[PDB]
Amino acid sequence: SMETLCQRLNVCQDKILTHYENDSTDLRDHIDYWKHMRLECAIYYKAREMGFKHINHQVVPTLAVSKNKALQAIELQLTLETIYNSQYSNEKWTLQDVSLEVYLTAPTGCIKKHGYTVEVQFDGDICNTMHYTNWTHIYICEEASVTVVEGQVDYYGLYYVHEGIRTYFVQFKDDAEKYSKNKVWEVHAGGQVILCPTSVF
């Protein structure tokens, strides 16, 4: 019934709010957060399926929206469970570290920590400067395994190396093409500058 969904939604939302207020650094609490986000999405999807457009006067999203959010929550929950069973479980882990905002930032689909700004100035114009996020710790999860890799910077973009394979998750030429008349830029990644390594014409 609608009544049962309402009651479950309350307790569910209360638990989520409690996590927000606690701001825990224990990974176990973040697994519990995502498990409740996952249940909340299923509740809203069922409410919509049953023809309700609000629940306790909160908007009930369309089916497609609640399903997409559910799939995100499930993926994050299972990823954090894999990390909890790994050697990295006892590290500090914040709600921001395990947020969808971080997870979907390039490289997408990865829990990441210790982000910092890399600035790229295109063709010598201050107004034509892009800001990107690099990460010292990128957690690559495949199946039940986790490996941490370091985000690295060179003239061409931001990359990591996993199992000997170099994968760029930002390529600065993509924004050069969009914003600039040139393929010449300067990369600032914190105290030093990376300049065009090749001849210029």
Partner: peptide
């Protein structure tokens, strides 16, 4: 055999007794 299947499972059991 992936994540969409867990969502389907969650929806089916929403009014069933909780085991997990």
């Amino acid at each position: 055999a992936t994540i969409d299947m867990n969502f389907q499972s969650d929806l089916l059991s929403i009014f069933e007794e909780n085991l997990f």
